Amino acid sequence: ASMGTLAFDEYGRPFLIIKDQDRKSRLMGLEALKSHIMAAKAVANTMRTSLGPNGLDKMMVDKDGDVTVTNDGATILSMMDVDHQIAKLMVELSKSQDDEIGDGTTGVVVLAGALLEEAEQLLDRGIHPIRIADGYEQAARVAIEHLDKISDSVLVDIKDTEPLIQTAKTTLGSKVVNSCHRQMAEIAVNAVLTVADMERRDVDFELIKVEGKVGGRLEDTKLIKGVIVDKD
Amino acid sequence: GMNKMVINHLEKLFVTNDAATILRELEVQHPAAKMIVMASHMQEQEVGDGTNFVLVFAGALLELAEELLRIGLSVSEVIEGYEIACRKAHEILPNLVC
Amino acid sequence: MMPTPVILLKEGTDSSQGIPQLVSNISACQVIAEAVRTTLGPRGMDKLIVDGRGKATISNDGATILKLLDVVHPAAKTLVDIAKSQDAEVGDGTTSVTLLAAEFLKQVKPYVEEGLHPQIIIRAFRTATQLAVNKIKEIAVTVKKADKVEQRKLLEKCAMTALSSKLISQQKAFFAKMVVDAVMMLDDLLQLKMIGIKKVQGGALEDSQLVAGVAFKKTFSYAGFEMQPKKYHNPKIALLNVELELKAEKDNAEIRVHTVEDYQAIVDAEWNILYDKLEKIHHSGAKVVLSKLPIGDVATQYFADRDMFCAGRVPEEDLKRTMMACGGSIQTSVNALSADVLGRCQVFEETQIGGERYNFFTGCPKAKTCTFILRGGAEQFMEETERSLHDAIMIVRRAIKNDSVVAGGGAIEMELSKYLRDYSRTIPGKQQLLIGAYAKALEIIPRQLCDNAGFDATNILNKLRARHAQGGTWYGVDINNEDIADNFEAFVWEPAMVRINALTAASEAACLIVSVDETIKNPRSTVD
Amino acid sequence: PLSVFGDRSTGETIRSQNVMAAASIANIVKSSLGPVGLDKMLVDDIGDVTITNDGATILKLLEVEHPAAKVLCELADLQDKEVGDGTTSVVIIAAELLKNADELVKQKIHPTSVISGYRLACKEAVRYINENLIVNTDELGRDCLINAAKTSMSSKIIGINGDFFANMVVDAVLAIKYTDIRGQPRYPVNSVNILKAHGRSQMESMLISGYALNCVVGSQGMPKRIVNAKIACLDFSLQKTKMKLGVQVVITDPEKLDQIRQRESDITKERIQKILATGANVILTTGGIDDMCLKYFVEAGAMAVRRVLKRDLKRIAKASGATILSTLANLEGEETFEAAMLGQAEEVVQERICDDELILIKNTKARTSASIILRGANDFMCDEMERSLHDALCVVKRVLESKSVVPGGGAVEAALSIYLENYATSMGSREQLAIAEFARSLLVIPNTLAVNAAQDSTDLVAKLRAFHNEAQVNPERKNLKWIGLDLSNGKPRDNKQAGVFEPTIVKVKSLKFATEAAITILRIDDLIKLHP
Amino acid sequence: LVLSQNTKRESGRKVQSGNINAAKTIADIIRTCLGPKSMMKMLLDPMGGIVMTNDGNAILREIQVQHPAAKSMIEISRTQDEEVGDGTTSVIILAGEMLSVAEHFLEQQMHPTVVISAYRKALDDMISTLKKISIPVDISDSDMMLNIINSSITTKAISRWSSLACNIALDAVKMVQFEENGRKEIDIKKYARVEKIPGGIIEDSCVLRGVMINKDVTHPRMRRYIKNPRIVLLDSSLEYKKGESQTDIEITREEDFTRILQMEEEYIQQLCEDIIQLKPDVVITEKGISDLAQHYLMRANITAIRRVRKTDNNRIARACGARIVSRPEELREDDVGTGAGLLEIKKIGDEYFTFITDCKDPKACTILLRGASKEILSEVERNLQDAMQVCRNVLLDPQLVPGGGASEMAVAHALTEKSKAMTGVEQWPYRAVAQALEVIPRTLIQNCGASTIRLLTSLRAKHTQENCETWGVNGETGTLVDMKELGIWEPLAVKLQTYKTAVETAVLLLRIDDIVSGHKKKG
């Protein structure tokens, strides 16, 4: 279950195949699958507590002693100092969800952990993992089709921002700014709508400058329809 | 003849049945073997083939010389006889051309 | 042995000779094959290898896995070498070559232990390989119609077969169609550098797309870039190799003046040189400017004032793809920017893809290049997708070269094994055992397929042998139904020269391994 | 998750490791099989040298750490103990069975089916040997024993001198023959004293028509030769009498001390005259004899030997008719020694053998005994001669007890291979492969013989198998069952007429033991090795 | 890990080549120490002594080697020395030569078993030829005995004094000869002791007609010179000692202590009276003698010597015809040793030596060696041992064989002639091992300093004639001379043992192709 192979030939002569083969480990098949599933389950169970409006924050400390209190799953996993390769896969999955969408970086990790947890007891009953993956793909296609079916459309007009404000409030509910919830959602919506190509085109984020300064109160956060610079 | 895998001091792998290459990639340290290797390499440079012949003939000659020395012959007598026989062989060789 | 005060070889030289070292070589080859044994077939599995620096590589490609292994056994490295050779010449079958070679060696190991002279084994391998290659060329199915639809269907089926073992096998039809479309737009040389492959993190596989043109990432825009319009409906593209910024005229240039009027004239002359280059580019009529060399902020603002797009520091390969797609010419001097050397495309647009900005050149009707944009949840995910697409692209290229196909799933190897056994049944008998061992060793691939699928290999092999003996050429392993079926009718198609090269390389490796009798290992120099 | 403080191996890894260990053990001794086999030289890292060809001795001397390799080592030891010959063939066969069974298992054949097939194949091979391949020794005579001994001593240091060594072995074995109850003649080997002494050539080895002691007379004053020996075997020391732990001597009158001290030795004196008065000439005792009793024997002109080994004394008493006496006590509470306790021999001599002396009790009456003095060039040669001689004695004993022999030189293995290959098609569906692999594994012995002969094994074994197939197919060619291998000329040869025999029990026990060992090792698919 | 970490295994052609090379090296060590012109070697004893000798066994015994083939060769040397006492260098040289000529064939594709079978057939023919070319010896003729001993010792350092050493060895062997109860024995080991006193001159060495021991009288009053002593030999102590039983005493009266001491004295007196009853003149005992016993013996005018070793007492018993007794109460007239004709305790150097050296018909003797130093006397003792061993060998077997390489060449020629009717594959090894016997004349010529090739060719041509089996090489002049006029001869037993032992050494080392080492004794 480790050290690779230790044979030294059946004639007594030295038998060296891989460089530094005595100092290298190796896992085989089902035991490796169980170890990976357990690591992913640990990561997902760590993440799942920070899910929802009542989710609690994770208070991250980097190698230099800087402290980051956060609820964003991608931010937590990026700063997490993992060594297991499957944990790195979880981190990269959360970062990919952040890059593509920007929200839901915690739901993906929990969902993947649950999927692997069920796959564990499915493998215990003697199902090939490729069959489990195929079934998961089929069920995911079914779920995506159902999501399209039960989807609802909202107006993205500037004259009526109520659905947009509600969506931003739903996104911000789980964060610490829920004290200033409606104001912060309104400023986010106005910031996006002011700078955007209206013909369903892209929104250039580098035209929105997010600058923070200590002091005052969180309620003093405001949207400036211009530029603020750290110059005099 | 069978090929030989030879790993030189730089871990470059040579697999061949060419005597000159095998001798080149071997870390020969005994200086008499060094002289025989130089003879083989000189044969390779002059002609390009027959290096294994050179090595085998030198080994056989030296073993039979050792036998002659053991039975009582002096080194000088063995050397003189070897030179005479080499001259005779070089004289005979043109007549063997087919 | 005696101390021999003066030793012949350098101290520490290790020598192994005779049958035991040959048996050890065979065992090492078996070990090497075992490391990639489970990555074969639609039920194959991936291997994760971590290097010294901690970076992991997840791959199903046999050649990649073997390369990531630090094999130091002189006989075992031959399997890695032949896998790399198969990857280079064909691009698919890197897993099959190692299995075939190791199985040949394992089959002839008992005869080696009996003191059989290796030359007979080598001659038997050569004869069997020649017969097998001739049989493959004889029974390979080719269609002489020059029909575009049938050729495209054959290409798609071959791509699907080459793709139905990787993590993108669930979308194998989709990527096979993309690969066929991309290859058919290459002109005559089928150069790989003309098929761009961009990996953008985040997004499903179905979000990956093939661009009928060229696309590349945004390249370090300077200030004032955001005022440039990011969409054009009929732009002319100026492909340049020019540094458009204020700089010293020459590295060894020196200006000597003794009057302030000359000083002002010199600064105005530098500005006028830059503005003359920019004015020539503007009056060329182009709307999109791409340069291999950096483009300064002054040039960026100048182009923004004219409602023009600029992008400096574009990689050379991307510029070549843009030239082959839009149809212009890369210019080192802007002194003659005639309409002949200007690219042209239907639509240019900058769009955001997964947190990154990409410039799109679409609508080129005479484009000879492509651009794959791949989406995934991890960088190793995209790496493995790129490797699988590379395998498919190589297969489609070889199929373009010649449309000679054989049925996969081990059907071809059952036919070859039956033919070789029938041939061996009609020879005096010393070569008969060796050729029969070769034919039996040819059964490893379907057996490995059954083992990977979790089947019972013995019953499937017996049924396949009975079916082939009693009539039937393209019967192989049916993975979904846990049975056997006519794989040609199931469209499990492979180019014939894939198996031809696999057999040739495996036989050559086996002969080379068997031919060796003594291994000499000189001590390391400067172990440090 | 297991949290077991040790290393765990499971699946194909442990099976391959066990097969590798067994193959290594087999390959260690594969080069010492058959007449063209060669001996091995073992050094005991202190300078001790052991030159031997016996597989059991080699495996017993070696240091083995893997449990699977151990299993084969005590397999060879058990084969040596229960048979005495074939301690290398059993190891080779067991390893080949393990190798082919592991190949079958790797082919996804369940190990239980392989075990069942191996059991069936072993039973059928034993039955085929018993009813087809045995030759009764009644119609062969003493030549059968001579040929069996010569075959046993091939591949040994005394192989070429077999023409004389076999005669010596047969004579000794027939000499030590005795009959017990139920009328079964038993041949108690290990009652033949084997004495080793370097010196003259091998051909000067002597077979004593009596018994040989590795002891000398206690005193130079005693004669070194008595014609009409009246042997008195004793099991008590003849020393000055000492009171036991529970008895003390306390003196209150000084006049008694001299009498006490005088009787202290007069007791043993009186015992000596009681022994000698009956006419005894040779006195043998397991205990020591002090100076005074040695002088007592010197004056009487008798021979006295001290510190005689108990087994040698028992053999001498049995052969000469003497009775071991641990004490001189009759049923009347007296000290006595009757003449009926005396053994007789035609001569007792202390001969000189290469700067050393040993006692020869020649031509004992009432029973015929035997002993062998082996003359070699040095100690290692004598030790190897002793081991080979013991092998030959065991083979002759097996032949004389079980009166059936089988042809040698791989004839039995080839016949069984052909028969089992034919028979596998009639039994089961998956154990058929196991029976076929058993048949193939049985072919390693002729292959090893041919390989050791530096000859083409493939064509020779093919010819042998063709001969046996013709024998098993054509009813009128059944005389080809005895076709074996002629290692000198490298050709098939009728070994029955060539005089290459061996006991049937050797093959039967070797097959059974190898099958059981292979089955035992084949059931391991998981290994847990706790740290010490 | 199957075998241990320290288990080293090597096999193949390398093992055979290494074994043969090790045997050749062992032979080369003592090559120059053969023949009348051999030169001596200095061996430094690890305990600190110096061994200066040219004896093959003495040289090889002090060599510590690691290669097991060398150990086998050393054991061969020891076996040859023990069995016959001569020809120790010859057997080593012959074994090396046969192993070399066997390596020649092993380099080709010949299996070792064929070489071994050819070697055994050749050995049988060698024995037959030696028994054929032998000549009888009349043991009653002392001149032939002396000449045989001289030819035995002419190659040693004692050759300068040949007549004296020959007479000493012959007399010692003849007088130690014994026969009892129909059994004949010689027993140079137990009796015929060699005792060396450094100093004096070698010509003063002689064999005494009796036994000499390094002992003195227990007290000055007894006589140091007795003409015709009646010697009584004892084994037990002559002093009061404890018994084996637990024998505590309890004293409650006044006179019991004095009575106990007086009884001790009375017991000593009773033992002394029992000894005196035989009227002896000398009392020799294994153990101590109490002073009171000495006084009681002196009152009867008896010389007493105590603490004599058992071997010396046995030698005295053989010499003077006495019997060792343990209980003086049972001392009979037969046990009294009469036959010694003189007993004398004289001072040599600064030590006292007891002489009993006028015995009539003595069956034991001592050889008194006087010389320059201890190492010279050790070498002289070794040479005398060789002489006595040769004397007893030729006295048991009266067959004799020509020396100086004549027998080697004769047997080689006979075997070569027999090899012409083989027509098999064994003829080549048979002829090679036949011609391997030429190494003895070859090394004799090499040590002599003459031309090896020319002399050997002349000898080989000479041996092809009809009657030339006695033609050898004059080892001190390098000329072909008939050995029936030179006078060099060897006992047939020595040659037979040498040939057999060399051939079987070659067979034993040829039977081996695999070497494993490093394992513990496991016991």
Ligand SMILES: Nc1ncnc2c1ncn2[C@@H]1O[C@H](COP(=O)(O)OP(=O)(O)O)[C@@H](O)[C@H]1O
């Ligand atoms: N649909 C299928 N059914 C059965 N076998 C298949 C199918 N698709 C591919 N194979 C088999 O998979 C093997 C190729 O596996 P893969 O690892 O992708 O490449 P390689 O040739 O390097 O092993 C081929 O031998 C082929 O016979």
Ligand SMILES: Nc1ncnc2c1ncn2[C@@H]1O[C@H](COP(=O)(O)OP(=O)(O)O)[C@@H](O)[C@H]1O
């Ligand atoms: N003269 C001979 N010719 C052919 N084969 C022989 C001869 N003598 C013995 N054999 C065979 O050689 C095989 C190996 O015997 P050997 O290894 O010496 O005994 P063990 O197995 O006790 O070590 C035996 O099975 C026997 O049949």
Ligand SMILES: Nc1ncnc2c1ncn2[C@@H]1O[C@H](COP(=O)(O)OP(=O)(O)O)[C@@H](O)[C@H]1O
């Ligand atoms: N005077 C002589 N001339 C020639 N040869 C002699 C003479 N004396 C002895 N030899 C030979 O020398 C050999 C004895 O050599 P030696 O030094 O005694 O060796 P080792 O002690 O082993 O016998 C004998 O074989 C004998 O034939």
Ligand SMILES: [Mg+2]
């Ligand atoms: Mg959210």
Ligand SMILES: [Mg+2]
């Ligand atoms: Mg050439």
Ligand SMILES: [Mg+2]
């Ligand atoms: Mg593939």
Ligand SMILES: [Mg+2]
């Ligand atoms: Mg045997």
Ligand SMILES: [Mg+2]
């Ligand atoms: Mg001598």
